Design a protein around this ligand. Structure first.
Ligand SMILES: [Cl-]
Lengths: 50, 452, 588, 200, 232, 393, 116
């Protein structure tokens, strides 16, 4: 019974903490990377016209 | 008429040696081959005007083309004869119907209602959908959107509300304005066939914009629709319900147009003025003090990646007065419509419920049904993670309640119209499952009178 | 006939030319003395800015620029079938013949069709007849299979004054029409800009199922005539075989194949294997009713972008005749790569992942050009274009811009799965991930044309497959021997659907095609076994007794796919054997 | 755009009584203090700010509807006159100034509404009154600045906002505070700033 | 040195097995005569040793006539160029080879010219002299960086991730100068070699290359740190 | 800006003795090689470079303070004259040239300091000397190019750096190397380049680091996480590499007459295995780890703490000879090998660890054993084998 | 201004000076305002390419001089935007200063004083 509960805690740690934190961070970084790429081309277009 | 087109760069065109040209003025390009394209002045400087052509600049010979400045912005020719008629994104007839004779022409941007002249949204609109009418009530003058996703049945829900919507104890002064934005031919055909088959067309004005139509036409579409609605509401005294889908296609078109002008992109690539732009549409909803009539809006949108924080549902939620959420979990359970009442909300619902509007037991049962369903869902999730023996005898009752609530109450079918009386009575049947001692949100006077 | 421009600047792929004021925006041009392919992107006064789609090395100011006087167009007329073109309709076979080389020389301009070949024109309209766009004035028996119908061009309206049968080239006047602008001559060839959709009378709903003969498709994920389907193409999933099956078995009149911008050696395979495909009905090469567009990755970016447009314009042309056309594009991911390249070359504000912000619109423009229509003309004839498009994202992820925008405007998705191919399950179509939004309407059609509850069978068939997924998780965890008899049965019926129905050998003489009638009979017996065995369980029989008692009849079910089309009773009579065999089992 | 002159600022050390338990107890604001209310949509931001407007122990409320819903401005004009003080028999509207530039009204006027409001607050502060200034929402003010920055073709800073966003915000809030006002009286007054923010 | 574009219907399909002498390639990711099969590597990974090994060991079974190897070094350090040259001489592989060596401190315009010089030599030996030619080119990433330098000098606005919009056309024009041609005895086989910046396969250089070439051989840090040679 | 002409450039095949264990063993540099040390701020890049400058077996050191802290130049002029080579009697300053252009000195002079330094190094190289040139930091040189590019309003590359950045870096590093100098004598000389790089946020994907890694051959990636737990030198052993490892391994095998190449490969393989194990442990726990995997973690721990970690400020630990390095690594691997056998003989991980406390303490303090007393390290191998066998029985 | 006063008091008036400057983030923001107004070619986050150099001209104004009794000790204070240490302001400052003392919200919320 104790081994079942120790396994259960490791399952819940992954399911309710570890995995969601990874999913949300991946989504965030992916978004932030795209934003910076657009800001970069925006600057280049400005510098172009200079 | 000027034959002084100086530059064409992409969809953008510069016209020189002009006078009396204004910002946002509509223009007309007579090509060297007699073809006519319309455009809009984006910017005017000294003797130059920067214009964008709706249909593009492909095939245009500069020296042999001419530009006419029309002297007015984009307009809609309005009439009460619009009811029963189908138009495209720019208000041109799409149904091979008779000639339309306009009473007047109206700037499709409309005017801003003086905040002091504005009247708070009031009174009940019966959609015939229990999850809406009871728990998330639609009020006359309200903006109450549907947040959906790809593959979810928002088009069936839109068509159901459109034909079922009505005002009680008030005959022959209700109209629906239906705007389709950037949708495919086949989904346009779905809507057209459904309206005609049910007879909903006879009380509707339809503006049908397609996926392969010019992006500028796609963004003009909701403004054509709202201009028609305001005319019917404020000049003809009607209660008008405006349903528009898909607002996600609208924002995509806006982003496409924004990128063409090489404007600085905002969050997730959408224009920095996305909020403001959406607001100029959604704030046309409401009532006016001293005037008969009202404009009510139901914007329908698909949340990209089912993400509610995405700019489209996010900025919409910052503008609207609540939201109706469709979920895949409920859709996969066969619930029609798959409305999740837990994240759904109507902020103005108080102004459309109670005695004289619906019935005296409206608010109490709503508070109780919502509370019991939330507790029921909570008990269900507890049984999932810890097992059925983790629930108390009461928790088991609430769990069973949430099942019947979804299966019998929320689920009604896409072609079933429930009167508010039927919805309220059905709510009392589900509440009777629970012990009377557990109905703590309802006073004893209402319990004694209604509880079956 | 217009003014020739003069180059004033060469800067990489960008060329500027003055004296261009008589040309138009989006005109195709020949740049420099060599005359390489280019396009007018901008115009300031008389100065045109030109994107050049071939090497500009060796070009300098002072050299001429000649406009073609038109945007990118196609020649449409006798001599187009059985030919292989690139994205801008360069005749690849003719290039070999004329230039006597294995290369596409820079500057070489050759007409898309053969303007010297004699054709027999057969006149079918009488003099004095009033005509307009779409009206058929005659026909040419172009190939051994296809009759090419000569139609009155768009823009022409009037009275036929002179016409007769005879031998002509596509440049000879075959007809005299009295229009408002006076007497005009028609030839057998008309031109059309690839970016503009050929006009129709009315667009109709595509509600008639295509018969592909491929069971997984026709039954569970059907596409209609005028519909559209997306197909991911991971390596080793048997995509090309599925494509070949659809191209030769589907009940369409003509096929247009488009290679958008493919790996050189992969494009060669298509060039090789497609003419080797045999038309089932005539025994002729499939090329007898096929037009093929072949672009390698080093073709001009303009040809790779125009690939699908050049192809659908041609499809629209044969559609206008009253034909059913399949347009098959592979890969639209490579077409979109050309759009991504162009977006960067035009210095635009980029959309998602570097694709232009108008990616979604361009896709919508293409797919909305496919469909079922009433063609122009007094006949009011119907034609259709059904679009089958391969996508091939970098990681095989669907959520990427190209596949996502495609699935917004198409209603069918055939999810090819490489893990199924590794399990020898062919065709490798994932029955869980795939879908068809035509299923409900096709179901109504099928129930009517069969006078059977076909839609009930299909949904029941999918339900068993769906439940199989759930039951397999339990088997993996608990074990097969711990399931109930009802669950063990469901797994067997699902196994029979997968093996005896879904799995289909394209290279077997009989299994390569299954008629609509045969598909019904096959699904009937498989479900009838499930029904009778389940009725046996509730009558007191045991699962193993049913299995051990029905070895012979289940093998008849397994061989049903190999039963000839003339002997369909040998499948239908299995139903009686099932009920009789299981009856004895319930007894014994 | 110019803050009204004072003698000197003082420490805002007297807690405001909003009567809202979570605020007065755990996250209190003082008279002359400033409080930001950032939240997602549908989190009750308008109910919170209305509660503060009607119950706070200030002499005057300046309420600025900056780039928001028209119905919320309509709610204020309808409700405020009906909220009667039992002691003095006066309504909340009889000590309120309302400034409204809704989401679909001219965008530049969003910035105008912010400065119109704080300047009126400073005016009543100079008389020796305690004033609350509610800005809902300051996010829409920033959007206005971003729109104009684009028209001017300026170099964008964080998220397309102009580089002077931070200093504009800092300057606004530094106009709030408890002060000794000009005059031989050396009278004291305060402005307490309550600002909604609407982060995407 | 620009060459001419091969008519897509003039190309013949790759038929003959090429024995590289490397198990992980010959067996699991077989190289066929006329294919373009690149190596995707990274900084500090041993694509140098693998390139030398393949050029050294590559052969077709039977045939008698052997491989002429054209080796192009693009923007590499002298130390690496000297390794290649000395390996070719010490094994006698130089007698089969033509080497075009461009160094990191050579002009950007020379780095751009190098692959074109090498491929022009290959097509001449193959399509005019009837030889079977194996073309090995490293490092293609150095070629791409040279393009950015010229592109910036003309003040061109970059495409995805800072590279020219016409990068695809550019890479495709180089990599498609390969394969058998109908009616011709000789052939060109290509093995482009590139380092993936930050080991990122979504980077424009390896991403676009994979769209053009018929597969890719991938080297990894995990295998190399474990002492696997070659770390395929 | 003109490279001093030579007769012939040669292959740098003789390993530099820096005396720093992680470098000399796992990521070695040769005389004539080029190495970069990219790291975040506060990762100890300065101590690393000073250690190399003071302990390397070169004839001359050219130290270039490029756009950095003034006190670091002051530290060098004060410390160097005090560092006496006992085999010579001469200070380190008597073989050092210093070029200083601090961060608040004129920006354009950062580029000049770089070229001034390399030319002086080439001058002494031409005499037949082995020279090491330290550039700290090359990022500040790149930022000077970027600021000037921006002032000329040129079309920039990534992060505003000019697009010719990679070419400039290439011209510098291609001046380093082992050569035969001009003259009838045909003297051999060399320049070894050691350059600091300072990527913002520690992100090595930035243009300076990326362009540098395309032309250098050794990468000593400094790690913020190692620095925070005071693991010095904070070289990331998973990220770092040396293209000279194989050649240096051959040289060392010959010098030591030992299988040194195998030992280094095995050491790195254990470190790579620890990394893969840690990926699981972090997202699962050490609960289900077998005795073998637990042994792997202990051996890798010993490699990290007893070998890789090295205190530059300890009189003995500041420098480790090749032989002492060999003996220390031998001992560490030997414990792993003997413990591994014991596990297969039925002994438990817990028992093996509890019975070897005293001997593992000797391993942990091997780094402090004097060079004249290397027999106190080599003898540990016999204590390991005797102790572990006693545990088995 | 402050550093000129400091170096004066230290090196011309023989004092030991402690310099405290807050908030350095507000200094960098001002630099960006001017850089944006001049339409200069932006670096990271819109900050000018010369941010490191500019900050160095301030922080390097500290230390001691041989033969002089005085000294300048600097304790600059900056708030890290979004609590992000990799932001240009704390990142570049860290490459210049002789260490840094970092306060965290985690330690602060746990009642640690100072939350270092
Ligand atoms: Cl809100």
């Amino acid at each position: 019974a104790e081994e079942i509960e120790k396994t259960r805690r490791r399952v819940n740690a992954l399911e309710y903490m570890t995995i969601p934190q990874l999913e949300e961070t991946i989504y965030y970084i992916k978004m932030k990377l795209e934003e910076n790429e657009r800001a970069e081309v925006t600057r280049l277009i400005k510098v172009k016209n200079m | 008429e000027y034959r002084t087109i100086k530059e064409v760069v992409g969809p953008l065109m510069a016209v020189e040696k002009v006078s009396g040209v204004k910002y946002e003025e509509l223009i007309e390009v007579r090509m060297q081959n007699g073809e006519i394209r319309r455009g809009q002045v984006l910017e005017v400087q000294e003797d130059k005007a920067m214009v964008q052509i709706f249909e593009g600049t492909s095939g245009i010979n500069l020296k042999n083309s001419s530009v006419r400045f029309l002297g007015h912005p984009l307009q809609l020719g309005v009439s009460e004869d619009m009811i029963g008629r189908v138009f495209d994104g720019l208000g041109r007839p799409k149904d091979n119907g008779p000639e339309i004779l306009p009473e007047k022409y109206l700037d499709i941007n409309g005017e801003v209602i003086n905040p002091i002249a504005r009247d708070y949204p009031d009174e009940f609109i019966q959609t015939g959908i229990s999850a809406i009418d009871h728990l998330n009530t639609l009020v006359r003058g309200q903006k109450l959107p549907v947040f959906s996703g790809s593959g979810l049945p928002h088009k069936e829900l839109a068509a159901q509300i459109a034909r079922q919507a009505t005002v009680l104890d008030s005959s022959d002064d209700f109209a629906v304005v239906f705007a389709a934005i950037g949708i495919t031919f086949e989904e346009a055909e779905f809507f057209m066939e459904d309206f005609r088959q049910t007879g909903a067309i006879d009380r509707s004005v339809m503006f049908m914009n397609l996926a392969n139509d010019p992006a500028i036409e796609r963004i003009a579409t909701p403004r054509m629709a709202l201009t028609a609605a305001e005319y019917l509401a404020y000049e003809k005294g009607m209660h008008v319900l405006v349903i528009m889908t898909d607002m996600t296609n609208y924002a995509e078109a806006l982003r496409e147009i924004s990128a063409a002008r090489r404007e600085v992109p905002g969050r997730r690539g959408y224009p920095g003025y996305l909020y403001t732009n959406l607001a100029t549409l959604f704030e046309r909803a409401g009532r006016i003090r001293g005037l008969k009539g009202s404009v009510t809006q139901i914007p329908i949108l698909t949340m990209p990646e089912d993400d509610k924080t995405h700019p489209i549902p996010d900025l919409t939620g910052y503008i609207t007065e609540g939201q109706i959420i469709l979920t895949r979990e409920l859709y996969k359970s066969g619930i029609q419509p798959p409305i999740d009442v837990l994240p759904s909300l109507s902020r103005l619902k108080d102004k459309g419920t109670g005695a004289g509007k619906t019935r005296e037991d409206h608010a109490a049962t709503m508070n109780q049904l919502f509370a019991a369903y939330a507790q029921g869902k909570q008990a269900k999730e507890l049984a999932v993670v810890l097992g059925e023996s983790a629930l108390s005898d009461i928790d088991k009752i609430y769990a069973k309640f949430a099942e019947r609530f979804e299966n019998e109450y929320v689920n009604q079918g896409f072609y079933t119209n429930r009167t508010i009386t039927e919805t309220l009575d059905l709510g009392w049947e589900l509440l009777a499952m629970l012990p009377r001692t557990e109905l703590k949100r309802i006073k004893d006077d209402l319990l004694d009178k209604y509880l079956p | 006939g217009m003014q020739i421009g003069k180059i004033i600047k060469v800067s990489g792929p960008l060329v500027m030319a003055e004296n261009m004021s008589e040309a138009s925006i989006q005109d195709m041009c020949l740049v420099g003395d060599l005359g390489v392919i280019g396009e007018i992107i901008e115009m300031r006064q008389d100065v045109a800015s030109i994107q050049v789609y071939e090497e500009t090395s060796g070009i300098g100011p002072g050299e001429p620029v000649r406009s073609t006087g038109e945007a990118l167009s196609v020649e449409l007329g006798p001599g187009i079938i059985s030919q292989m073109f690139d994205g801008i309709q360069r005749p690849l076979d003719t290039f070999m013949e004329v230039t006597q080389s294995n290369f596409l020389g820079r500057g070489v301009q050759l007409p898309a069709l053969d303007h010297e070949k004699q054709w027999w024109f057969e006149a079918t309209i009488e003099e004095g007849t009033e005509v307009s766009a779409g009206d058929i004035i005659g026909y040419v028996d172009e190939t051994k299979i296809i009759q090419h119908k000569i139609m009155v061009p768009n823009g022409i309206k009037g009275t036929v004054q002179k016409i007769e049968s005879g031998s002509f080239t596509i440049d000879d006047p075959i007809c005299v029409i009295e229009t408002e602008q006076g007497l005009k001559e028609l030839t057998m060839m008309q031109k059309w800009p690839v970016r503009r959709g050929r006009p129709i009378k009315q667009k109709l709903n595509p509600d008639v199922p295509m018969i592909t003969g491929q069971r997984v498709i026709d039954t569970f994920f059907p596409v209609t005539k005028g519909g559209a389907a997306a197909v991911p193409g991971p390596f080793g999933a048997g995509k090309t075989v599925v494509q070949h099956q659809i191209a030769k078995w589907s009940d369409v009149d003509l096929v247009v194949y488009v290679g958008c911008g493919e790996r050189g050696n992969e494009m060669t395979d298509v060039v090789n294997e497609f003419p080797e495909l045999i038309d089932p009905n005539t025994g002729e090469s499939l090329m007898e009713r096929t037009v093929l567009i072949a672009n390698t990755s080093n073709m001009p970016v303009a040809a790779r972008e125009a690939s699908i447009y050049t192809g659908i314009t041609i499809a629209e042309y044969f559609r206008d005749m009253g034909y059913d056309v399949a347009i098959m594009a592979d890969s639209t991911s490579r077409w979109a790569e050309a759009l991504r390249e162009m977006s960067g070359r035009l210095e635009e504000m980029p959309g998602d992942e570097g694709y232009p912000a108008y990616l979604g619109s361009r896709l919508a423009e293409y797919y909305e050009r496919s469909g079922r229509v009433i063609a122009l003309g007094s006949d009011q004839r119907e034609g259709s274009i059904t679009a089958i498009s391969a996508v091939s994202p970098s990681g095989g992820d669907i959520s990427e811009p190209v596949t996502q925008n495609t699935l917004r405007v198409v209603k069918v998705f055939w999810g090819l799965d490489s893990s199924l191919a590794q399990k020898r399950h062919f065709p490798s179509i994932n029955w869980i991930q795939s879908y068809s939004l035509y299923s409900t309407e096709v179901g109504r059609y099928m129930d009517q044309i069969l006078q059977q509850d076909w839609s009930d069978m299909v949904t029941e068939g999918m339900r068993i497959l769906q439940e199989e997924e759930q039951l397999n998780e339990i088997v993996r965890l608990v074990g097969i021997d711990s399931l109930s008899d009802n669950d063990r049965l469901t797994l067997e019926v699902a196994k029979s659907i997968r093996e005896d129905y879904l799995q289909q050998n394209a290279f077997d003489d009989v299994d390569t095609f299954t008629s609509r009638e045969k598909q019904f009979n096959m699904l009937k017996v498989i479900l009838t076994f499930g029904k009778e065995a389940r009725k046996a369980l509730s009558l007191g029989a045991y699962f193993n007794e049913i299995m051990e008692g029905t070895v012979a009849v289940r093998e008849r079910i397994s061989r049903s796919k190999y039963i000839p089309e003339e002997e369909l009773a040998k499948i239908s009579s299995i139903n009686e054997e099932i009920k009789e065999t299981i009856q004895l089992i319930v007894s014994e």
